[PDB]
Amino acid sequence: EAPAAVVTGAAKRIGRAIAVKLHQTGYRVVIHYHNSAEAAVSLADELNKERSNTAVVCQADLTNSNVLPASCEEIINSCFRAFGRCDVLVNNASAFYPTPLVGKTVETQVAELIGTNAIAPFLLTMSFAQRQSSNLSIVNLCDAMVDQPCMAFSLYNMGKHALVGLTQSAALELAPYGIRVNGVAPGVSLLPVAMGEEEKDKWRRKVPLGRREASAEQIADAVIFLVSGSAQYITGSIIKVDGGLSLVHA
């Protein structure tokens, strides 16, 4: 039977590309989304056209709250309900915006930034593991620039740092169950919609390898390697896919 993967925030951009590549590799997919219903459904329909009954969607807010553990259990459960199994979890969904130290309240910002980037991945990991020639693994989308952060992104950066912790802690704890846990750490990949080209170019010009951002597919390629049979000894590793950006001094 075909293996199955959950990809969070999979309606657009990197998560979409990850879902597509997994599908092309032979996985059935749960496309998790928050607000982007039309795009999630569009993707599911495209994937099911290619092969019937191989893609479903699952809506959830991954903001931290009292109901987050249940929402996370329900995402994993939907993979088991659709496909009978859950082999791969990709923690991709992420809130990203500034929170300077000096209309959303700060606790709402905490909930969203820390919930999406850290707590939801932890809860999803718990639910994934509890539900367990297998090749089980988790891939967390990290940040190559986590030790050279953008100015005034404290909470975002804290979330991504916590995600490195999770990757390492879960790699250690789940290794006896045969579940590998790794990361992929983009530098500059797809830039924000509507960011002016002139500002995109300030970031692009910093990248040693080609003075361009990573495509979503280039990020997805590293995810594919990590879930593959060619990575069966690899756990707790975080692979930068950054064109050398992180090596560049100020």
Add this chain to the structure above:
Amino acid sequence: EAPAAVVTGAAKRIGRAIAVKLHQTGYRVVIHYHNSAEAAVSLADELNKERSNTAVVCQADLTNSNVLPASCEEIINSCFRAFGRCDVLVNNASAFYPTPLVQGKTVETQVAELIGTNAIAPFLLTMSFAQRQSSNLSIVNLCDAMVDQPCMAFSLYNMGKHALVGLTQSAALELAPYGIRVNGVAPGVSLLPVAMGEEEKDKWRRKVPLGRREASAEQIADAVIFLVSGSAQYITGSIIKVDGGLSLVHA
């Protein structure tokens, strides 16, 4: 007049030794505490016996919730209220317990406690500290030398301490233009947990290359003192391991 410092979880163990050593150095101190009211009040008495009106206690839960920001604001406000200034913040308070991934508090409570005390409260305290501001302003965060070689089944804790590294770095960057330095001190094995059995304590002691023993609370405090001092005025974003070489030892 004398500078002033806030130390969180300062009623006992490492936080107490930090508060003591700051006070010996010249600081007026806010002794924050959660449950350890008797020990906090007793420390404030000891320090005030040495120099009157140089210590106050301040009670707060640093578990994450919708009122955590107000609580953190109030800790900083309590230093200004007692002393008219706030020069140093030491983020020492910390929950520490296992949260296994695979099968009596709820998981949401565990998240709130472990992530709140180790990460969110230091963030909010840092915000309130900066907002309220010769001078030598700085923050010291109590980190963990074993953050990349964590205890088995401590994912939430480890996540909190990793986030604390991120905060230390991010706040060092953002607050540098205001002359506020932000650094860390990362113990390996120091005062063993009260609940840990004697055999397990001896197991941990035996892992430490430099002396086969735990760091004293005073040894940790010595590093905090250095970082807040005039001898550390160009140091920001640095995390100093005080671990006797423990983090260097392979499995």
Add this chain to the structure above:
Amino acid sequence: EAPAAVVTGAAKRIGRAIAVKLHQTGYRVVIHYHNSAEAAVSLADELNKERSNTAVVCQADLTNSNVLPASCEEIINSCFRAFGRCDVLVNNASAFYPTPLVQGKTVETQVAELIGTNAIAPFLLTMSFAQRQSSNLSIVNLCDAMVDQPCMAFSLYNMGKHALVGLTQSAALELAPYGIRVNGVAPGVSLLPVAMGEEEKDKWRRKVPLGRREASAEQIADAVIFLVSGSAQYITGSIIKVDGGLSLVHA
């Protein structure tokens, strides 16, 4: 026309597994060796029996000396002589033995071998590789996942593997504009030393969270093949651990 690769120390163990996998992927290969001539020739024979004129051997000492630069130039030149191009360089050859700080070979010989093979020869091979240059050019350095948790009394070996991390990063930066990617693969416990008895092997195996066993040579080679592939064309300056979680395990 098929691309071509140089693998240093390729007569056996991990270097052989890398050359075999590259050859299976469609590369022509230069099998560098130092003392292991029989094994090297035996490998070239096997690969050439599979596809004619696709493997050659190349002998060189990679100990540091005043002629090491000429030796490294000649290794690269051997790939151009055989195959008319050189797309991939794998720096695998390595001396590995203790050098106690307190107490056969003179210390300067130990420096020349340990630092030469692990760091200086990779540097010179990298210079020659770059100087001699649809296309997918890259270099892969065999690093060590335990570089920050080293074996006791292996100072010079550890210094050499640390230098190799530096080269990997420096070379990635400097050669990015030429389209040459520079990455590493960092084993933890893979094939154990021939001189190690089974009991000592089992002590190391038991340390590994993922399966309590060493990485196969093929498992190491798999990570090399990825980094040289089209699937890694935005990856440069990255060191991939292939260690089964070993580096995450505390003392």
Add this chain to the structure above:
Amino acid sequence: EAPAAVVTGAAKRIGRAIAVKLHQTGYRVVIHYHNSAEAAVSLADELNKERSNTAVVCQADLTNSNVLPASCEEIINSCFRAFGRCDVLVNNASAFYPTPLVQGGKTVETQVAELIGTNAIAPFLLTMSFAQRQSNLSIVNLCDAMVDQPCMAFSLYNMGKHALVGLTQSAALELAPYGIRVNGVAPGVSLLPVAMGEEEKDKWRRKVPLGRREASAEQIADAVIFLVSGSAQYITGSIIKVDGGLSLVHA
């Protein structure tokens, strides 16, 4: 009895400041120099003027060669000859210049010998000699906060500073049972190279978050003083950045 310290490359700049502060703290000092004899003697004269027979000079090239081990043994021996003891070793001497990988005075192997010898091999040999000849004993290695974000075309220098991180960590582990602590101080931008253009100096200064200026030599020395002190007696294998946040600033 006053403790004694060896400081390599102590005639000028950061090494001079380290020698001065150690001396001011109560140490007797060996001022090592290569080319700067006039300056080394001028320093010694100044220090002996404060306290008679507390400063001596010691000449040596620290370029790697057949004779480097003997030269390093004699640097340590000079401290025991002058003062009867050797408590502290500061590995400060360093060659620093570019070594491009791609080319359009020195042979590349001479560059290897200077850059890797001064920054890594001489520190290793001085460490062996220091430990062999053996209280608050420690070693401090001058590292580089930008070791993972290196200057373009400085591969060999960077390899040497990476190897020094390895030595710091390896020696911390191996010498801990002897009570010898081994730590590092990692500047970012401190005293700018004398041959750097003034416009290039201001470009580096403007990058620094904490004050948009370089560290003074004394602010670097302050961190050395902490690490050798009784306030750091549980600290080994630690590298303290003194970089004003520079290493945290993205491209």
